[PDB]
Motif scaffolding. Sequence first.
Motif, PDB file in Angstrom:
ATOM      1  N   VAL A   1       3.323  -0.014  15.137  1.00 47.09           N
ATOM      2  CA  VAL A   1       2.577   0.531  14.001  1.00 47.09           C
ATOM      3  C   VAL A   1       1.485  -0.422  13.539  1.00 47.09           C
ATOM      4  O   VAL A   1       0.871  -0.194  12.486  1.00 47.09           O
ATOM      5  N   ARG A   2       1.223  -1.471  14.332  1.00 48.46           N
ATOM      6  CA  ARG A   2       0.366  -2.604  13.984  1.00 48.46           C
ATOM      7  C   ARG A   2      -1.023  -2.170  13.536  1.00 48.46           C
ATOM      8  O   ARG A   2      -1.397  -2.398  12.383  1.00 48.46           O
ATOM      9  N   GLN A   3      -1.770  -1.501  14.414  1.00 49.99           N
ATOM     10  CA  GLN A   3      -3.084  -0.960  14.060  1.00 49.99           C
ATOM     11  C   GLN A   3      -2.978   0.103  12.970  1.00 49.99           C
ATOM     12  O   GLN A   3      -3.880   0.245  12.136  1.00 49.99           O
TER      13      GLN A   3
ATOM     14  N   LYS B   1      -5.450  -0.523   9.825  1.00 42.74           N
ATOM     15  CA  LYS B   1      -6.529   0.459   9.871  1.00 42.74           C
ATOM     16  C   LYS B   1      -6.556   1.292   8.599  1.00 42.74           C
ATOM     17  O   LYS B   1      -7.633   1.563   8.041  1.00 42.74           O
ATOM     18  N   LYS B   2      -5.372   1.702   8.133  1.00 42.67           N
ATOM     19  CA  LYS B   2      -5.242   2.385   6.853  1.00 42.67           C
ATOM     20  C   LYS B   2      -5.758   1.517   5.722  1.00 42.67           C
ATOM     21  O   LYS B   2      -6.361   2.029   4.781  1.00 42.67           O
ATOM     22  N   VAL B   3      -5.573   0.203   5.830  1.00 44.90           N
ATOM     23  CA  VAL B   3      -6.156  -0.713   4.859  1.00 44.90           C
ATOM     24  C   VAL B   3      -7.655  -0.942   5.087  1.00 44.90           C
ATOM     25  O   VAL B   3      -8.412  -1.107   4.116  1.00 44.90           O
ATOM     26  N   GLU B   4      -8.100  -0.934   6.346  1.00 38.01           N
ATOM     27  CA  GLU B   4      -9.498  -1.095   6.725  1.00 38.01           C
ATOM     28  C   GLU B   4     -10.377  -0.027   6.112  1.00 38.01           C
ATOM     29  O   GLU B   4     -11.501  -0.314   5.689  1.00 38.01           O
ATOM     30  N   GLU B   5      -9.879   1.197   6.043  1.00 36.60           N
ATOM     31  CA  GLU B   5     -10.676   2.200   5.360  1.00 36.60           C
ATOM     32  C   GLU B   5     -10.290   2.287   3.886  1.00 36.60           C
ATOM     33  O   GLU B   5     -11.054   2.831   3.081  1.00 36.60           O
ATOM     34  N   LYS B   6      -9.151   1.698   3.498  1.00 37.67           N
ATOM     35  CA  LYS B   6      -8.790   1.611   2.082  1.00 37.67           C
ATOM     36  C   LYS B   6      -9.741   0.727   1.298  1.00 37.67           C
ATOM     37  O   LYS B   6     -10.110   1.060   0.166  1.00 37.67           O
ATOM     38  N   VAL B   7     -10.132  -0.403   1.878  1.00 39.14           N
ATOM     39  CA  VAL B   7     -10.971  -1.339   1.151  1.00 39.14           C
ATOM     40  C   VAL B   7     -12.389  -0.797   1.011  1.00 39.14           C
ATOM     41  O   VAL B   7     -13.083  -1.109   0.037  1.00 39.14           O
ATOM     42  N   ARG B   8     -12.810   0.074   1.917  1.00 36.58           N
ATOM     43  CA  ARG B   8     -14.125   0.673   1.826  1.00 36.58           C
ATOM     44  C   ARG B   8     -14.107   2.045   1.178  1.00 36.58           C
ATOM     45  O   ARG B   8     -15.176   2.637   1.006  1.00 36.58           O
TER      46      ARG B   8
ATOM     47  N   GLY C   1       6.201 -10.456   2.508  1.00 34.26           N
ATOM     48  CA  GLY C   1       5.854  -9.365   3.402  1.00 34.26           C
ATOM     49  C   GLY C   1       4.395  -8.959   3.442  1.00 34.26           C
ATOM     50  O   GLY C   1       3.662  -9.147   2.469  1.00 34.26           O
ATOM     51  N   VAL C   2       3.967  -8.426   4.594  1.00 32.43           N
ATOM     52  CA  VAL C   2       2.612  -7.886   4.706  1.00 32.43           C
ATOM     53  C   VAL C   2       2.335  -6.743   3.738  1.00 32.43           C
ATOM     54  O   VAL C   2       1.385  -6.851   2.955  1.00 32.43           O
ATOM     55  N   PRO C   3       3.120  -5.640   3.704  1.00 36.63           N
ATOM     56  CA  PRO C   3       2.720  -4.554   2.797  1.00 36.63           C
ATOM     57  C   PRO C   3       3.047  -4.842   1.354  1.00 36.63           C
ATOM     58  O   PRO C   3       2.468  -4.207   0.467  1.00 36.63           O
ATOM     59  N   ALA C   4       3.964  -5.767   1.091  1.00 38.42           N
ATOM     60  CA  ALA C   4       4.326  -6.091  -0.274  1.00 38.42           C
ATOM     61  C   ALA C   4       3.237  -6.863  -0.996  1.00 38.42           C
ATOM     62  O   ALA C   4       2.809  -6.438  -2.072  1.00 38.42           O
ATOM     63  N   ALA C   5       2.750  -7.952  -0.418  1.00 37.50           N
ATOM     64  CA  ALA C   5       1.711  -8.726  -1.057  1.00 37.50           C
ATOM     65  C   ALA C   5       0.328  -8.399  -0.549  1.00 37.50           C
ATOM     66  O   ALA C   5      -0.638  -9.006  -1.025  1.00 37.50           O
ATOM     67  N   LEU C   6       0.195  -7.480   0.402  1.00 34.95           N
ATOM     68  CA  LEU C   6      -1.134  -7.093   0.826  1.00 34.95           C
ATOM     69  C   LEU C   6      -1.854  -6.347  -0.283  1.00 34.95           C
ATOM     70  O   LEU C   6      -3.065  -6.494  -0.422  1.00 34.95           O
TER      71      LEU C   6
END
Lengths: 186, 186
Positions: B82-84, B88-95, B2-7
């Motif tokens: 819920v794609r973006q 997006k939540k990860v896009e600002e998570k990494v920064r 899964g995307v959120p599982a192994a992301l």
Amino acid sequence: VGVPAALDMMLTGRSIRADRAKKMGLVDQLVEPLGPGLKPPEERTIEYLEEVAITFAKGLADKKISPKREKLTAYAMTIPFVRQQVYKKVEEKVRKQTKGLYPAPLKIIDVVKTGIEQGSDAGYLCESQKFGELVMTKESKALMGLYHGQVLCKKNKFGAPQKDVKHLAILGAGLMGAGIAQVSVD
Amino acid sequence: VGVPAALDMMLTGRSIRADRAKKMGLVDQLVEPLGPGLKPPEERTIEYLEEVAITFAKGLADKKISPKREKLTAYAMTIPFVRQQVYKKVEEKVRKQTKGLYPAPLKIIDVVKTGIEQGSDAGYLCESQKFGELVMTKESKALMGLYHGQVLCKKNKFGAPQKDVKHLAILGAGLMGAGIAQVSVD
């Protein structure tokens, strides 16, 4: 107005009066007609709308009123995955209502099937490859002649009506008599 | 998986032991090692798996067991819209975790950003235009030398250990003494 809202409109064929069009949302404001005037009682009603329009009109230029606005709002953003699970239900709906030997109406479904999820402005040329097909076909070629006769026999066709009727006399109750009374009374 | 599982796995860097991998779902069956054998107590455990594998193996050929199988099952079909609103939540998570001057890890996000919703088999050549970029860059070019030194100084480097220690003596409590006791005890 929406896919499921007008999807039972644009291929059901049937018209709507102006009362439900507010709750539907095509037209937004209503105005009832008028009776007696200084001019005859219908010519003012066509000349009444000009001024209601001009009092809407100056407001549109300086934006005092906005062209913005509960079942469609549930739909309003919600189709990521139910996509096939609506037009498939309609795909077998059109062949359960009629039978499958109307090649006309499903050929407007493929429009709204491809208008969603694909190029919308690019979608305005698909029906150019479609309208020429289903007009130049053997399905509805004589349907225009059916409509010419439909309008052609809603005509008096015998001179002028002399001494019009106002009373009737239906000899015998039952299924025809009460039947034709059901339509000849209102 | 899964995307959120192994992301939160493939760019957190950190490893997982084999116990959580069943609840995650990468590996499915576990087998604990063995102690004493007719052969020395670890060489049999590497020769034990061959026979558990061969008793799985004949079953795979005639299909007595299947390679089929509660938070990911909620996700499992559910991303139409819920794609973006995840990457997006990860896009600002990494920064927010690091700062924005790592051009490495977001360049695996664009993979899993484009692997979804686009050509999956066509997606196996995007990273061919990416792996050559972020390896031949000035971000991690010396990071390989950091790893050479990382493995290079986890080495004894002084001959052979003679008369190894078993006891310690930490003169003074406080923050270092109890501190180095916290690591030198287990």
